[PDB]
Amino acid sequence: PIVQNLQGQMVHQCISPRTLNAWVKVVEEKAFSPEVIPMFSALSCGATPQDLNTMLNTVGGHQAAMQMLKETINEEAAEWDRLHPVHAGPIAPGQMREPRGSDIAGTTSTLQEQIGWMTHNPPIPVGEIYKRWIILGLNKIVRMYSPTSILDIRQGPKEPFRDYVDRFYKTLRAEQASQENAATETLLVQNANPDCKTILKALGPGATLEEMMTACQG
Amino acid sequence: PIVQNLQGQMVHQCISPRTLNAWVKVVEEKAFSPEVIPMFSALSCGATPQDLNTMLNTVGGHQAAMQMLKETINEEAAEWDRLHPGQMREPRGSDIAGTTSTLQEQIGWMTHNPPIPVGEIYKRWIILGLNKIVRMYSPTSILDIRQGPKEPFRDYVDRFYKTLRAENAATETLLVQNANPDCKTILKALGPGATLEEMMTACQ
Amino acid sequence: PIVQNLQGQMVHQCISPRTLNAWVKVVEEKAFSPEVIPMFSALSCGATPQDLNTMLNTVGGHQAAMQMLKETINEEAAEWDRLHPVGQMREPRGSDIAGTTSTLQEQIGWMTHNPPIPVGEIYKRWIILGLNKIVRMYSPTSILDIRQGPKEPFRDYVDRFYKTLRAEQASQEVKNAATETLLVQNANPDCKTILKALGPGATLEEMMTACQ
Amino acid sequence: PIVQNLQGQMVHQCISPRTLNAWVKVVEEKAFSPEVIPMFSALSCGATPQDLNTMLNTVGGHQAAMQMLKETINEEAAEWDRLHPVHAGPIAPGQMREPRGSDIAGTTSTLQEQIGWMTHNPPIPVGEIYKRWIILGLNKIVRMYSPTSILDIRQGPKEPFRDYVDRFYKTLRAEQASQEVKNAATETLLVQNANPDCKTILKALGPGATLEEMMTACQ
Amino acid sequence: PIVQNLQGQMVHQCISPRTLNAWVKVVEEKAFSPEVIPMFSALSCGATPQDLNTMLNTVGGHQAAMQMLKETINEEAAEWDRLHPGQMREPRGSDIAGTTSTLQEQIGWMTHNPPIPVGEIYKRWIILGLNKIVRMYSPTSILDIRQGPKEPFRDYVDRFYKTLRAEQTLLVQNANPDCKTILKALGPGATLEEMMTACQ
Amino acid sequence: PIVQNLQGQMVHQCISPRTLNAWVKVVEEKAFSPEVIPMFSALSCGATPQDLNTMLNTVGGHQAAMQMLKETINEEAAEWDRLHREPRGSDIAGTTSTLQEQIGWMTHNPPIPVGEIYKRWIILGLNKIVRMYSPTSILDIRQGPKEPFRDYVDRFYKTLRAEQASQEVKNAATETLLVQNANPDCKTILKALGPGATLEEMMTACQ
C-alpha cells in the first residue's frame, strides 16, 4: 500500500502477511456473502493496483467468479479509454505519462508508475479507481451467488420472529448486494406466520421494524 | 481512524486487520450481550464515519439487528437536520453517517478549527441503536429473576445484574424482594443501606 | 493509555485490540484467582480512567463481582472527596478520578500536567482494592481444610496450601503462624515423620526435597 | 528485505518470522497450485537475493521441484552472462563491480554487495531480477504439476453450471500457469463441453455472450 | 522495560501483552524444565525490578516454587546489604528487589552514568532461585538412567543429558550390553559424536 | 539482535517473543531435517552471541544433539585461539563476554562480526547433527512399480539432501544412480533420452 510516514511523506510499504492471509481466509470461509465486500475494501485500504491484483490472484478457488471479474474489469478499462484517450508524443520533464485503462488495472504499468501517479501533485488515485471497478464486479458476483429468492422466505410455524427476520434481511442483502422500501415492507408482513401476521396487521401501516419485533416477541 | 502520530501530528491511518477481525469475532461469539458495546466503543477509538460503516457492514449475521440499527441512525440523522437547517459547510445528518460524505470531507470536519467531531457524533448514534438491540435481545425481564430454593445467593445475584445490565431504584428494591425465603428475611434484617458485600456474606 | 512519543511528550494512544482481548480472556479463564490482579495491573500500564473503565466494562460475566467493585469505587471516591474539600488549576473530584464526570481531555490534562496528578494511578489503586476484596471472597477453601492426600505427592500438597493462602490474603505474621502451625501438622503420615525428623528451622526447600 | 524507514531512507531489514512461516505454510498446504506464485511474489516484496534463497531453502519437501528450479535459475544466469559480459578493468571510483549471473542469484555475492546494487543510484535491482528468474522456474513447475487436461472437463449431467465453470477455469489456470486464457478457442470449448440442457440455452444466446450472461442463463 | 528507541534514547516502556502472555504460557506448558530459564532471561530483557515482579506474580500455580523463590531472594538481598552497609544514594537489597523502591528510583539507578543495573542484579538473584527449583523438580537421579534392551542409543543419550541438565563417564557404564562393549572398544577420549555413530 | 535505527545508527534491540517461539516450534516440529538450518540462519539474522545462546538453550529436547553441538563449538573456539579488548574463542561464543562487549565489536568501524563468526561455528555443528540424524542411504531409494516418477525423485533428492546436509548433490554419480534405480518402464524411456537430459525433460518423459 501507500501510507503516510513520520516525516509526513506518502511512501510505499509492502503488503503484509497479516493482510494477505486475512483476505484469503475470508474468501475461504464466507465465499461471496455480501459482507465480504466491506471486508475487501477495508483490507485494501491504500492499495496500489499491484496490491489489488495480488489480493485477487491469491484466491485459489472460485475461478468462475474470478473470470467474471476479469471481464467486468476489462469493460471498465475500455470505458475509461473511451472517456480518457491518451495523447501521442513525448512526456514533459517532471510529468507522468497519462494512464490507460490497463495502466490503472496494473497490467501495463510498473509499481514505480503507480506510485508516481498516487503521490503526484495533484494525485491520480489509480488505486482507488481500480478498487471501484473491482467492487463493481464483486457486487455482480454477490448478486449472482445469492442462494435464495426473497419470495421463498416464510416464517416457520414454531420459528421465533427474530430468526425469521434474520433470514429475511440476510437474503435480501445478498440479492441486491446491498443493505438499502414499501414493497419489502408489505412482503415481510405478508410472509409472517399466522399469529404474527394478525398482530402486525393490527399495528397498522408505517410501523418501524423495532415496533414489529417487539410486538411478536415470544 | 485519525491518530496522533509520533511527531505529534494528527493524520488518517488505515483501519487494521487486527481491529477488523476483533470486532467481527466479538459479534460472532457474544452476539448482543451488554459487554459488546464497551468493546465496540473501544475498537472504534478515533474512527471516521467511514471506519464505523466498515465495522458495521463486515457483520455477516444478525441482519434483523443491523436493519434496526439503520432505522435508528436515520431517525438520529433526521433529528440532526431539524436542529440544523468564506465559511465552512456543515454536515447534513447523512454526512455524519458517511452516506453522503467522502473520507476527505470527514477528515475535513474532524480536523477543522474548530472541529466538528463527526466520528464521535456518529458513534453516539450507533451506540444508541446498539443499546436498543441489547435491550430487545435480553432473554428475561428483571421481574422473572428469582432465587432458586437450592441456588447459591451469588449465582442469583449474578443473574440479577446480568439481566439488569442488558436492560436506579430497580436495584435495591427488586433484588431483595426476589430472594428465596431464608435469605429474604436475613436481608430485610440488615435493614436499609446494606452494601452488596454485606448482603452476600449474610446469605452464604 | 498515555505513553511517550519521539518529541519526548506524553501522548494519548488508543488502547490496543491485543490488550482488550488479553484482559477479557484472563477473566474468562482464571476468574478471580489471585494472579489475575498482577495481570490487570500490568495490562493497564499507563491507563487513563477511561481505559480503566473500558477494561472493567468489557467483562461479560461475574456481574455480582462487578457490582461489588462499583460499590468499593464509590466508597473510595467519597473518601477522596472528604479529604479534598472545595491561574490555579482545578483539582479532581472523586467521580473525576473514576472517569464518571471527567472527559478524556481533562484526564489527559491532569496526567500530563507539571506536576502531574496521576488520576490513572489513583483510580487503579481503588480498583485493585476492590479486586482484592473479591479475590478474598471467591477463595473456595479455608487454609484449615488443606490436608495432604495419603497418596498425594508433597509438592502437589504444598502447591494447594500456598495457592489457598495467597487467595485468603494473610498478613506476613499470620502466613508464618499458619505455616508453622499447619504445614507439617497437616502433611500425610509418611512425610510427617520424615519432616519432623529434619528438626526445627528447616527451609521449605529442604522439606520439599526430603519428601520428593 | 530492503525497505523504506520513516526518514524516507532505504535500509536493510531482517526477514521476519511471520514472512518465513507464511511461505513455508503456503507450500505445505497448497503445493504448486497456481495461486502459490502471486503469494510468493508478495511475500518476497523488497527481497534481496539472499532473502529469496532463504525462502526457497526453507522448503522441506518437493525436492524434485526445488531441483528443477535450480536448473532454471542456472539457465537464466548463463543467459544473463551471455548478454552482460562483465568487462575487465578496475572499478571506477564510486561505482560497483557489474553483477555476474551468479551474483544476482546470491551464490557469489555478499549481502553488502547486494545492498550496494539495490540502493545504488541508479539502482541495479538484483532482487527483482532474481525474482523474475525464480518465477519463470516456478511457472514451469506449476504447469507440470497440473493434473488434468482442459479437454477432459465436461459438465456433469446433474452438475450445476457454476461448479463446471469453476473446474474449467481452475484447470485452464494451472495448465498455462496464467489467468489470461479466455480467447475464442476456449470460448468455443466452454460451450461445446457443456451438458445438453445448458448447451442448447447457451447456443441460443448467440455469439458475444458475457460469462455473466451465460451463468445467469443456466442457473 | 528500559529500551533503546529509534532516536537513540534510553526510555521506560510498558511491558507488552505479548511478553506477559508468552511467559505465563511457558510456565503453564513446561513447568520447570531447564529450558524455561533461558526463556525467562530472554523475555525479561531490559526489565526493571518492577517488571520482574510482574512476571513472577502473574504465575498462578506452582506456589510452592514461588514461595521458595521468595526465600532465595531474601537471602540474596540480605547478603547484598551485608556487603554494602552530589553523592547518589545506593540501593538496599529490598530496593533492588523492587519492594521498597519506586519505578522512578529504579529508572534513576538504571539510567545513571554510570548505571547501577538493579534490573540485572535482581535478575541474577531470581535466576539463582529458579535454578534451585529446576534441580529440585528434576524427576530422576542421573543414576537411574539406563539404556533399554530395545531402546535406540540416541533415545537413551537424550534421556541421559535431559536428566543431567535438570540436575544442575557413567554414561558408558549404564549402556546396554551390545553398545557397552563397542563403546569401551573406542577406548577413552571418544567424542559423543563418535559414540553415537558407533551405536547407530 | 543489532538492527538499524532512524538516525542510521546500528543499535541493540531485544530478541522478540515471535522469534523465540518460531525457533522453538521449528525444532519441535521438524527435529533435524535439513531445512531447519536455513530457518535457523534466518531467525538469527543480526544475532549477538547472547541471542544465539538464547535460541539454542531454549530447546528442551534433543539434548544429545545439543551436547554434540557444545563440543563442536568448543573445538572451533580452541581453533580460533590457536590462530590468534580483542575477542578470545569463548568471547565469541558469549561465554566470557558481556552484551556490552559483544555490541562494541559488532558496531565498530570496521566491525568485528562476533555474531556472524559464532553463527558459522553453530551451523557447522548443526550440519554434523543433520547428517548423523539422516535415516536412509541414497542407495536404498528405488522407484516403486506403481510409484509416479515425481514422487520417486522427491524421495531421491530429499534423501540426498539429508545425507550431505546440502542441495549441491547432482553430480554424474547421482545422475547414474537415479536412472539406474528407476522402475523398468521409466528406466528404458530415460536411457532413450540419451545423456545431458535436464531433470525437467526426464520428468515430462515419465509422466
mmCIF file of C-alpha atoms in Angstrom, chain D residues 71, chain F residues 172 175-176 179 187-199 201-202:
data_model
loop_
_atom_site.group_PDB
_atom_site.id
_atom_site.type_symbol
_atom_site.label_atom_id
_atom_site.label_comp_id
_atom_site.label_asym_id
_atom_site.label_seq_id
_atom_site.Cartn_x
_atom_site.Cartn_y
_atom_site.Cartn_z
ATOM 1 C CA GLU D 71 18.340 -25.763 -13.213
ATOM 2 C CA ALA F 172 27.485 -37.651 -12.524
ATOM 3 C CA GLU F 175 22.839 -38.892 -12.183
ATOM 4 C CA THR F 176 23.760 -42.514 -12.964
ATOM 5 C CA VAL F 179 18.312 -43.589 -13.706
ATOM 6 C CA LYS F 187 14.317 -46.754 -16.910
ATOM 7 C CA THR F 188 14.018 -47.549 -20.628
ATOM 8 C CA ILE F 189 12.453 -44.190 -21.587
ATOM 9 C CA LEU F 190 15.161 -42.346 -19.648
ATOM 10 C CA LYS F 191 18.054 -44.254 -21.208
ATOM 11 C CA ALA F 192 16.420 -43.352 -24.520
ATOM 12 C CA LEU F 193 16.678 -39.596 -23.896
ATOM 13 C CA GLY F 194 20.425 -40.084 -24.006
ATOM 14 C CA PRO F 195 22.915 -38.144 -21.870
ATOM 15 C CA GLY F 196 22.669 -34.479 -20.921
ATOM 16 C CA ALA F 197 18.946 -34.512 -20.240
ATOM 17 C CA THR F 198 17.553 -31.923 -17.819
ATOM 18 C CA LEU F 199 15.513 -33.063 -14.814
ATOM 19 C CA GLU F 201 12.881 -33.331 -19.578
ATOM 20 C CA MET F 202 13.182 -36.584 -17.621
#
